[PDB]
Design a protein around this ligand. Structure first.
Ligand SMILES: CCn1c(=O)[nH]c(=O)c2c1nc(Cc1cn3c(n1)CCCC3)n2Cc1ccc(-c2ccccc2)cc1
Ligand SMILES: [Fe+3]
Length: 291
């Protein structure tokens, strides 16, 4: 039978707290694993998300000088790379965020402000999330153009620490493309396809999501460009993805969904979409075969 799925945006209240791994549950190898102050801070953030209910303004956070410096370091280095690496759409929307949401080296944008910006641009909004959700619950947010979004900042000891999302990843990797109508439609349709789908189908949709939204490449005016958020917030892999050292295959959901999603290393392969519109068309054909 069909598993429960959210029927309206406020129904995400009922699954967004189904957290499998809380954000305060640091990995053994986490840079902050032995840092008690950081652990409390991570608790503070997880509790903010847990207490959030749809309709709430997303709580504003006073980031510490240390957190802001970490953001600044990440922001400054990535922005050197974006003009030669990022896709059309990303480069078009990034300056709008500097103008209206306070994206600057010395200021971490607030999720509420970013959410309000996205609502006007594409109907996308942000929901703070305590930690890891099932693929089903995470993707279901996208059906209502809701992006589940971490609010904490990576540990300052390693501004280059990438195997968990932090708010640097969300704001620099995800948000500029959620502001693009073609991409917002593509993302929403992943979520819509996932609603009430089989466990098998959800897993395949999650893998397609991974190799587009998180690690996707696209071809634009004959050039390979980056649109994956995991790449756009990782200085080293951003460079690697467009070097000659990377293996690239065309995006093709029936083949892409067989690919293992790697966590603690660079991906072994990247998938190239022709455009957001083509990727959307390919998913539509694919979802008919699994749902
Ligand atoms: C469809 C797969 N998928 C899922 O099934 N469920 C998700 O919850 C999910 C997700 N995908 C992303 C977003 C995400 C995950 N990652 C990145 N973005 C960047 C590259 C590192 C991994 N998330 C959100 C998310 C994932 C992990 C955490 C987390 C936070 C602290 C400690 C451990 C884990 C918090 C939020
Ligand atoms: Fe992400």
């Amino acid at each position: 039978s069909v598993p429960w799925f959210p029927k309206k945006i406020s129904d995400l209240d009922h699954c967004a707290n189904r957290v499998l791994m809380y954000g305060s549950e640091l990995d053994a190898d986490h840079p902050g694993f032995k840092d008690n102050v950081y652990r409390k801070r991570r608790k503070y953030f997880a509790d903010l998300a847990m207490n959030y209910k749809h309709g709430d303004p997303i709580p504003k956070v006073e980031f510490t000088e240390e957190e802001i410096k970490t953001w600044g370091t990440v922001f400054q280095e990535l922005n050197k790379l974006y003009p030669t690496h990022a896709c059309r759409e990303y480069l078009k929307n990034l300056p709008l965020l500097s103008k209206y949401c306070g994206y600057r080296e010395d200021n971490i944008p607030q999720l509420e402000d970013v959410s309000n910006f996205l609502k006007e641009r594409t109907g996308f909004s942000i929901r703070p999330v305590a930690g890891y959700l099932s693929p089903r619950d995470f993707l279901s947010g996208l059906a209502f153009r809701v992006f589940h979004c971490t609010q904490y900042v990576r540990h300052s000891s390693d501004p280059f620490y990438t195997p968990e999302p932090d708010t640097c990843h969300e704001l620099l990797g995800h948000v500029p493309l959620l502001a693009e109508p073609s991409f917002a439609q593509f993302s929403q349709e992943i979520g819509l396809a996932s609603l009430g789908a089989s466990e098998e189908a959800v897993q395949k949709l999650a893998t397609c999501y991974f190799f587009t939204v998180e690690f996707g490449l696209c071809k634009q005016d004959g050039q390979l460009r980056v649109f994956g958020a995991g790449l756009l917030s990782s200085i080293s892999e951003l460079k690697h993805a467009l070097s000659g050292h990377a293996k690239v295959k065309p995006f093709d959901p029936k083949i892409t969904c067989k690919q293992e999603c790697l966590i603690t290393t660079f991906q072994d392969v990247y998938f190239v979409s022709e455009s957001f519109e083509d990727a959307k068309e390919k998913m539509r054909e694919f979802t008919k075969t699994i749902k």
